[PDB]
Amino acid sequence: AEFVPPPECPVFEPSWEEFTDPLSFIGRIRPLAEKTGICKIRPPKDWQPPFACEVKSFRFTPRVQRLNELEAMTPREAFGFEQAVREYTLQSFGEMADNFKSDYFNMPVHMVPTELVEKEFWRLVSSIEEDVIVEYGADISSKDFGSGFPVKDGRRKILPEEEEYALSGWNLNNMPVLEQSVLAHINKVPWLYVGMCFSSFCWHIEDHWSYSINYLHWGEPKTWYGVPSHAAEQLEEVMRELAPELFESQPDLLHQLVTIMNPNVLMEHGVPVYRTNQCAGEFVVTFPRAYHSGFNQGYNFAEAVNFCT
Numbered sequence: 001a002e003f004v005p006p007p008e009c010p011v012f013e014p015s016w017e018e019f020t021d022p023l024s025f026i027g028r029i030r031p032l033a034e035k036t037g038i039c040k041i042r043p044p045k046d047w048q049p050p051f052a053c054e055v056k057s058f059r060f061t062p063r064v065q066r067l068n069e070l071e072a073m074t075p076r077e078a079f080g081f082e083q084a085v086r087e088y089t090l091q092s093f094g095e096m097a098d099n100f101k102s103d104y105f106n107m108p109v110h111m112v113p114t115e116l117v118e119k120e121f122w123r124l125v126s127s128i129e130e131d132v133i134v135e136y137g138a139d140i141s142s143k144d145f146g147s148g149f150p151v152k153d154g155r156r157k158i159l160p161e162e163e164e165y166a167l168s169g170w171n172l173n174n175m176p177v178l179e180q181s182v183l184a185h186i187n188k189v190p191w192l193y194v195g196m197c198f199s200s201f202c203w204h205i206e207d208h209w210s211y212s213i214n215y216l217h218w219g220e221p222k223t224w225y226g227v228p229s230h231a232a233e234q235l236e237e238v239m240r241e242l243a244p245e246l247f248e249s250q251p252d253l254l255h256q257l258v259t260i261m262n263p264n265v266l267m268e269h270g271v272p273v274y275r276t277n278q279c280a281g282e283f284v285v286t287f288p289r290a291y292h293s294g295f296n297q298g299y300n301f302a303e304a305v306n307f308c309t
């Protein structure tokens with residue numbers, strides 16, 4: 001009955017020499033990592049970038065996420081107004097997030113096992129008897145309050161010991177983003193995610209089947225699921241069979257806004273799925289056309305960007 005965790009995706013711990021160039025390292029791990037869709041990369045222990053966002057002015061209105069909204073399609077009074085609108089700071093969002101999780105599980109937030117949050121998340125997504133609603137500070141542009149990484153744009157002070165991170169190839173602002181094309185001759189910044197427990201992102205691939213790289217600056221883990229690109233059509237077939245019929249005729253760009261699916265459903269239909277808990281200071285790389293989804297274990301802060309090889 002309970003959720004069965006998928007097998008773990010690969011985790012790499014590159015040496016300082018291997019960590020010098022990200023594209024070179026990603027190219028070398030590709031024979032394994034492209035067979036799992038996602039992989040996790042732990043930087044050397046001494047690689048600890050500062051957090052460079054404008055914290056005092058960081059303000060946002062997160063999106064409301066009803067975990068069982070797809071199951072609820074199977075109408076409620078005054079639907080469309082089920083939640084009051086609240087703006088947060090980083091501090092007040094974290095206070096709300098910690099209070100939600102500790103109240104939900106009746107224990108301190110860091111004492112909740114990651115396996116329990118995972119099992120509860122997937123139970124709540126399919127539950128009609130229990131309507132859990134959370135909030136996600138998603139798709140916050142790094143242009144609003146700055147990137148989480150230090151950047152030498154003369155908009156924020158950079159200490160001397162922080163300059164190496166402003167210049168690092170693993171700084172998401174220094175990843176290559178310009179795709180080659182003939183139109184580029186005739187004629188892209190990172191996004192931020194402030195998570196709370198159960199906030200989530202559903203199955204999707206990137207525009208132009210791009211790679212993506214994801215960094216968890218701080219907080220509780222982000223739980224990932226990934227499908228290798230050689231099974232992309234298998235996943236899409238399972239979606240065609242079991243996703244809500246009302247959304248069946250929708251293009252992929254719109255379908256991937258809403259369509260959540262339990263990883264066990266994909267696995268029972270022969271789709272390979274891998275998981276990982278991305279912890280603070282760790283990278284997750286998604287490979288071209290690798291479907292991925294996930295949810296946050298608690299209050300955290302992530303940064304993501306598509307990159308080109």
Ligand SMILES: O=C(O)c1ccnc2cc([C@@H](OCCN3CCCCC3)c3ccccc3Cl)[nH]c12
Pocket residue numbers: 136138139191193200201202203204214222256257258302304
């Ligand atoms: O939250 C994470 O850590 C996370 C990790 C990896 N990939 C994604 C993708 C999303 C989101 O894409 C929303 C779409 N915007 C994307 C960038 C700005 C423009 C349009 C998303 C997709 C489905 C459901 C919810 C969410 Cl927030 N979140 C992700």
Ligand SMILES: [Mn+2]
Pocket residue numbers: 204205206212292
């Ligand atoms: Mn993505």
